[PDB]
Amino acid sequence: HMTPPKAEKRPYPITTHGDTRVDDYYWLRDDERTDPQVLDYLQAENAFTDAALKPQQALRETLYEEMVARIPQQEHSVPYVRHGYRYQTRFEPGNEYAIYVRQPQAESEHWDTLIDGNQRAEQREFYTLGGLEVSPDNQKLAVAEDFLSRRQYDIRFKNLSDDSWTDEVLENTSGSFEWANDSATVYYVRKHAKTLLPYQVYRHVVGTDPQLDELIYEEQDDTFYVGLEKTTSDRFILIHLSSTTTSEILLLDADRADSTPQMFVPRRKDHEYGIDHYHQHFYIRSNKDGKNFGLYQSEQADEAQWQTLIAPRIEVMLEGFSLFRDWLVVEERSEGLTQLRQIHWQSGEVKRIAFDDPTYTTWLAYNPEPETELLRYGYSSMTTPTTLYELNLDSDERVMLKQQEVKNFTPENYRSERVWVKARDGVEVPVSLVYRHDSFARGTNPLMVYGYGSYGSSMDPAFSASRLSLLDRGFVFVLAHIRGGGELGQLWYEDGKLFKKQNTFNDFIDVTEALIAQGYGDAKRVFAMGGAAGGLLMGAVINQAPELFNGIVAQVPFVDVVTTMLDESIPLTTGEYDEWGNPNQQAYYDYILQYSPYDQVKAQDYPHMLVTTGLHDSQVQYWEPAKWVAKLRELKTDDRQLLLYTDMDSGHGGKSGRFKAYEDIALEYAFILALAE
Numbered sequence: 317h318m319t320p321p322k323a324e325k326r327p328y329p330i331t332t333h334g335d336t337r338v339d340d341y342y343w344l345r346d347d348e349r350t351d352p353q354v355l356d357y358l359q360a361e362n363a364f365t366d367a368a369l370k371p372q373q374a375l376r377e378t379l380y381e382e383m384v385a386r387i388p389q390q391e392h393s394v395p396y397v398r399h400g401y402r403y404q405t406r407f408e409p410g411n412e413y414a415i416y417v418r419q420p421q422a423e424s425e426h427w428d429t430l431i432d433g434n435q436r437a438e439q440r441e442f443y444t445l446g447g448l449e450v451s452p453d454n455q456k457l458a459v460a461e462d463f464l465s466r467r468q469y470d471i472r473f474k475n476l477s478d479d480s481w482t483d484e485v486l487e488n489t490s491g492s493f494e495w496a497n498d499s500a501t502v503y504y505v506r507k508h509a510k511t512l513l514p515y516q517v518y519r520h521v522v523g524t525d526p527q528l529d530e531l532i533y534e535e536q537d538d539t540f541y542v543g544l545e546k547t548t549s550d551r552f553i554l555i556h557l558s559s560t561t562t563s564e565i566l567l568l569d570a571d572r573a574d575s576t577p578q579m580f581v582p583r584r585k586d587h588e589y590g591i592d593h594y595h596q597h598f599y600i601r602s603n604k605d606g607k608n609f610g611l612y613q614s615e616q617a618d619e620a621q622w623q624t625l626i627a628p629r630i631e632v633m634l635e636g637f638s639l640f641r642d643w644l645v646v647e648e649r650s651e652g653l654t655q656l657r658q659i660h661w662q663s664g665e666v667k668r669i670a671f672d673d674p675t676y677t678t679w680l681a682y683n684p685e686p687e688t689e690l691l692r693y694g695y696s697s698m699t700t701p702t703t704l705y706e707l708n709l710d711s712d713e714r715v716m717l718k719q720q721e722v723k724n725f726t727p728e729n730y731r732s733e734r735v736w737v738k739a740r741d742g743v744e745v746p747v748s749l750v751y752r753h754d755s756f757a758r759g760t761n762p763l764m765v766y767g768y769g770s771y772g773s774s775m776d777p778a779f780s781a782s783r784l785s786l787l788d789r790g791f792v793f794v795l796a797h798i799r800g801g802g803e804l805g806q807l808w809y810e811d812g813k814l815f816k817k818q819n820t821f822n823d824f825i826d827v828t829e830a831l832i833a834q835g836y837g838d839a840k841r842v843f844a845m846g847g848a849a850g851g852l853l854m855g856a857v858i859n860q861a862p863e864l865f866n867g868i869v870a871q872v873p874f875v876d877v878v879t880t881m882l883d884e885s886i887p888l889t890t891g892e893y894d895e896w897g898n899p900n901q902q903a904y905y906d907y908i909l910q911y912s913p914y915d916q917v918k919a920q921d922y923p924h925m926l927v928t929t930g931l932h933d934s935q936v937q938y939w940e941p942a943k944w945v946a947k948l949r950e951l952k953t954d955d956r957q958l959l960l961y962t963d964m965d966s967g968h969g970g971k972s973g974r975f976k977a978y979e980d981i982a983l984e985y986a987f988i989l990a991l992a993e
Contacts, residue, residue, distance in 0.1 A: 320361075323942075324357075330882070335909075369983065372987065375986040376979075383978050391407040394704050412434060412972035414433050428476070431448065431459060441465075442967060447491035467512070471493055473502075493544060503517055538890065547592050552568060554591065555577055560895070562586060598615070610628040640689070642662070690706050692704060698778070722779075729754065730751065734746060737831075763794060764793050769796075777795055786988075786989075792837050794836075814904075825864060862922050867987070882900065917944070924956045927960045928961045932965065
């Protein structure tokens with residue numbers, strides 16, 4: 317009855333390898349973000365969305381208010397000690413930004429303010445704190461702050477003796493910096509003005525003119541991220557260079573002012589490695605001998621001299637490690653589960669952190685001091701709010717330090733299961749799902765199936781407070797651990813990228829069918845959601861199996877895949893050839909075209925869908941979802957509502973917009989709940 321916006325068709329042929337695709341909405345891309353007909357189409361869609369969802373206004377308010385009422389307005393972080401000081405992060409009621417405090421470790425009573433984001437944000441349009449570190453002598457505070465919302469960070473220095481600031485600002489930094497052990501020399505990373513990619517390391521003397529800063533290193537290859545790190549030993553500052561596949565590390569003697577970069581292992585395509593330095597040894601996590609990584613000890617760089625501490629295993633992905641006085645602690649994945657293992661440096665005694673929950677995540681938390689037997693580690697499950705634990709590595713005594721406070725919540729009201737689905741090619745795909753016990757009746761409950769399935773990112777099963785808004789309205793919430801994700805290790809990822817990317821979409825469909833078939837949800841009330849690379853997932857799945865889902869939410873979806881990946885002028889295209897392929901190669905053009913959602917939209921019936929995007933961001937370019945919705949409006953045969961919501965907030969809007977984050981969830985959940993009623 318309401319006539320949706322109709323974008324002007326401006327046929328734009330794109331020909332590659334003699335293959336012509338006519339893109340009618342190519343013109344919705346405006347890099348300068350000024351063209352008034354481009355804005356007219358986005359505003360028109362926004363008004364259509366506002367008018368279509370007007371009836372859900374009350375439900376949105378109910379969702380918003382009940383989601384905010386679950387969390388406390390306070391939040392004090394768990395205090396940690398580093399270099400003889402205790403540090404706590406403080407969120408006060410009605411405060412937008414964190415306050416950072418500290419006190420001498422032997423002090424109980426008084427806390428000093430390091431920085432109050434609220435006072436730094438005063439008379440500013442935007443404030444992000446991107447970086448915070450005290451010097452080793454505890455006298456100076458290096459802060460990385462963004463006042464412009466360009467994710468370009470300025471570094472300044474505060475003298476903690478009197479709360480006076482130094483005169484200089486380091487501008488256009490990544491926010492990545494390290495103190496030398498003199499508490500006078502700082503290393504920082506400069507980003508390119510145009511491309512915005514970190515490419516330069518400078519040395520700066522605090523209290524001096526940034527013009528005096530020496531260029532320490534320049535990365536010649538812009539697929540390589542430049543990060544700074546500092547070893548557990550404090551002996552080295554690390555220049556960490558890495559593409560998506562390949563690493564290189566240079567050492568800087570943190571004990572001098574005049575150090576030059578010392579090569580560790582020169583880059584070799586598909587060799588990923590990270591290092592730390594402790595107890596006069598290098599520790600290396602490396603995939604040199606297996607995809608699932610190993611851990612090595614060395615006295616020098618020379619790869620040939622690396623002693624195997626932990627050999628790569630096909631069944632166990634080595635994720636990360638921490639170094640303590642008496643113990644190595646590793647984070648691993650096995651059988652679709654995260655785990656922690658400790659190994660005594662002397663005895664070689666192995667202990668495993670035991671976990672009795674089918675759908676949980678565990679990780680190394682922040683452990684800034686190695687001279688301890690106390691390990692801080694995180695835990696979360698689909699039924700158990702996020703917990704910080706402290707484990708005595710020797711006695712095995714485990715104490716809880718903090719729990720995520722969740723109001724109007726009792727954990728016994730909910731059940732979770734790990735399900736395995738045999739995919740169409742016989743591969744076993746894990747699923748994590750959670751629901752309210754008292755409203756569950758097989759074959760009756762609506763289903764919300766969430767996936768990502770790219771970059772080897774895992775959708776690890778953890779607690780969501782916002783999720784309870786679906787769970788307390790009868791929803792079964794499902795994480796589908798599809799290939800392209802990392803849940804079953806490096807091979808799980810590789811079996812859902814490049815010439816295997818289609819397994820990601822097939823796994824999502826196979827998991828959804830099996831869940832309905834086994835009675836976990838109502839076949840006529842199946843919903844799905846995914847964002848960015850997970851929006852690519854939503855886009856392909858509704859092209860390939862439109863009848864499976866009642867309703868979809870596609871957030872900032874990557875849908876114009878072939879056209880975007882043919883254009884290096886688009887931010888990220890050059891860094892994403894190792895994910896999707898380079899369609900300038902006919903083999904990748906053919907394979908990608910087959911799933912590229914924008915290219916595969918046909919005259920068929922589609923689910924109800926809400927599509928989100930953002931005008932003044934950069935994650936997926938705003939024009940992809942806008943072109944996608946225009947082509948869906950042109951071609952789809954059904955009468956169901958298709959909506960595009962474009963976030964207009966011109967710089968960002970993000971002046972601590974967790975208000976906004978909850979508002980977006982309210983809008984998307986109300987859209988889905990209205991469809992499930």
